[PDB]
Amino acid sequence: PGIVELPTLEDLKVQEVKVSSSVLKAAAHHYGAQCDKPNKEFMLCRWEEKDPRRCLE
Amino acid sequence: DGPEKNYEKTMAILQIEAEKAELRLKELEVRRLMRARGDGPWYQYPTIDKALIDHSPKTTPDN
């Protein structure tokens, strides 16, 4: 029943972090400890909205 | 004894029988509608209670 709204490919284009797993895991503790507030904002938005398209920004 | 005993006793018996007969006839109508639309006290078939649901946050955020 009706169209399912999907975000366009334009705003979807986002700089993707171009690093491997080892580099991520090696600095994961410091990465999580320092830059964490934007992660928490997105983490809360994903569990509260329950809709991925709402928190893409 | 006097005929007033039999007369008054019987008409009271007829009154009791009428209410008994009327209630049974109404009963088939009440029970019929209950089993059809089911918004009454009895005939309520069991349903899963809304208390078993785990509303705590899950591993997958969208669920």
Euclidean distance between CA atoms A24 and A27, whole angstroms: 6
* Total residues belonging to chain A: 57
**Data resolution in angstroms:** 3.6
Instruction: Check CB contact of A50 with chain B, cutoff 8 Å.
Output: yes
Q: What's the start-to-end Cα distance of chain B, in Å? A: 85
CA distances from B29 to B34, B41, B43 (A): 9, 15, 14
Contact (CB, 8 A) for A52 and B62: yes
Euclidean distance between CA atoms B48 and A5, whole angstroms: 33
Contact (CB, 8 A) for B57 and A47: yes
All residues of chain A having their beta carbon less than 8 Å from the beta carbon of residue B62 are: 46, 50-52
Q: Which of A37, A39, A52, A53 is nearest to B61 (CA)?
A: A52
* Total residues belonging to chain B: 63
Q: Which of B19, B17, B40, B44 is nearest to B30 (CA)?
A: B40
Instruction: Name the DSSP letter for residue A27.
Output: T
Q: How many CA atoms lie within 13 A of B36 on its CB side?
A: 6
Euclidean distance between CA atoms A26 and A3, whole angstroms: 44
Instruction: Check CB contact of B59 with chain A, cutoff 8 Å.
Output: no
Q: For chain B, give the secondary structure using H, E and C.
A: CCHHHHHHHHHHHHHHHHHHHHHHHHHHHHHHHHHHHCCCCCCCCCCCCCCCCCCCCCCCCCC
Instruction: Check CB contact of A47 with chain B, cutoff 8 Å.
Output: yes
